[model samples]
Target: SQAPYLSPAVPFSGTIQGGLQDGLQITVNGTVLSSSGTRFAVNFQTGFSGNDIAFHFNPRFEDGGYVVCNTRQNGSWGPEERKTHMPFQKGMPFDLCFLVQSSDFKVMVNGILFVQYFHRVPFHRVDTISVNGSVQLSYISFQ
Candidate 1:
């Protein structure tokens, strides 16, 4: 059986086409256009280290990028002021997953453990989530 944290109701699927970066970008098939009134999220109970979770693609805009909230919080999505890169192949298909916990955000790309993010907010007070740019999503789900 699927884990208790696995929800079948919230599923996302799509696709995207554009310039892709390498290593510094995450080219997902979807985009998080805005996170205006959303909260930062973390799945302390279902994630790896007791923090929220996110799957980040580098080379923002060039390739593709996406962020999902496992726990939901109300805050600015990212430090647009801060900049970085997570590269990937253009038009490549990647299966990504975020294992959220109370203290950390574990990222899984193509079913492989890839990166982690430290918790920057309370685990349970997150709620709003969104995507930016343009990309297609084949599927997305939460439980």
Candidate 2:
């Protein structure tokens, strides 16, 4: 199901309700705005504010498009892992899904397995989801 903010607004952000566990999947539907700015981020965080993020999915339109992945522990960010293969296009709609596993998060973009981010922090600790900046979301759901 989608969060309460999943409405007329496009930038949707909310909690996972019961937190995430192995085998759970979170799907995010959205369109990359033509003016998709420099970048936007989708984060799986631990709490309401100032906490660790199990995964940070960031897409940067700069330098001809690239996706960045990282983890945050406490207040410090880990080294970023970048995916130079950009499958998202400006003005195109996309479905991004994240699969929870015991050891990692598998990210699927537009129905295809795109990346796997091994947990730096425990994935079970992530209780919140946050989406911010230049993009339009249709809905964010859990399955």
Candidate 3:
């Protein structure tokens, strides 16, 4: 059985029972705030405070919409990969999924493949998922 969903709140953060492994799937159900703070983020990282993020998925509400993906290690961010074809909108609920693969994270928005970020660090090191700013989270689940 899948784990129970967590939270009906925004700016949420939680631990993945175990570190990420190949074939693991994470689903986040939420909506972007109509009057949100310009941008918001969904991150999968190693720890809460160390800033060692394996996946930094950020959506910005500017010029239609843009999504940025990158990685961080030791508080330093890597070169960003931006996707201009936005699959999100203000007040629209989104079903975002992250499928951990052997080489990259396949991201899906509302069931369609949105983007992918190749692993920079060992994917297994990522143990936490944090969401903050500009979004209202309905639930987060793992399988």
Candidate 4:
């Protein structure tokens, strides 16, 4: 298991030493900000740039709340996959987990299965994890 990242700053970006693989798990613990921005995103991407993202797990608190998942390749975005249910609340803490598998990314929020995002690109190409928008991070760990 990789060592945990504790209390990283907002707009955080960190490298995954050997990139992603099947059976690898990434967890983020944080609290969503109640004011200002109405959305937040966690991205597993290549390098440290936003040009190539394998999985973009975005939660938007709009129109009764929904999640938008997508992929970005060469600075262009693909079709969006929306999840209608929201499991996160502003001003509350969350345990957000991303479990990588051969076929998809299984997302869990607060110990419950939240959504599954099918691979739009090869998942192993993701070497960096980035978190941005309105949230206070307490922990980011690899398992």
Best-fitting candidate, scored by TM-score: 4
> Could you give candidate 3's per-residue lDDT for residues 1-143 as a string of tens digits?
25745565777778887889889988999888877388989999998873889999999888878999999999999999999988888898899999999989999999899998899899988888889988989888887
Task: Using TM-score as the measure, name the better of candidate 2 and candidate 3.
Answer: 3
Worst-scoring 10-residue span by lDDT in model 4: 109-118
> Candidate order by TM-score, highest to lowest?
4, 3, 2, 1
RMSD of each: 11.7, 1.9, 1.4, 0.8
Question: Worst lDDT window (10 residues) for model 3?
Answer: 1-10
Candidate 2 per-residue lDDT over residues 54-135, each given as its tens digit: 7999999999889999988887899999999987887887889999998889999987999999988887788888887788
Order the candidates by lDDT, highest first — what do you get? Answer: 4, 3, 2, 1
Residue 24 of model 3, lDDT score = 90
Off by over 4 Å in 4: none
Best by lDDT: 4
Give RMSD (Å) of candidate 3 vs. truth. Answer: 1.4
The residue pairs that clash in candidate 4, if any, are none
Per-residue alpha-carbon lDDT of model 4 for 31-99, expressed as tens digits?
A: 999877999999999989889999999999999999999999999999999999989989889999999
Better of 1 and 4 by lDDT: 4
> Which wins on lDDT, candidate 2 or candidate 3?
3
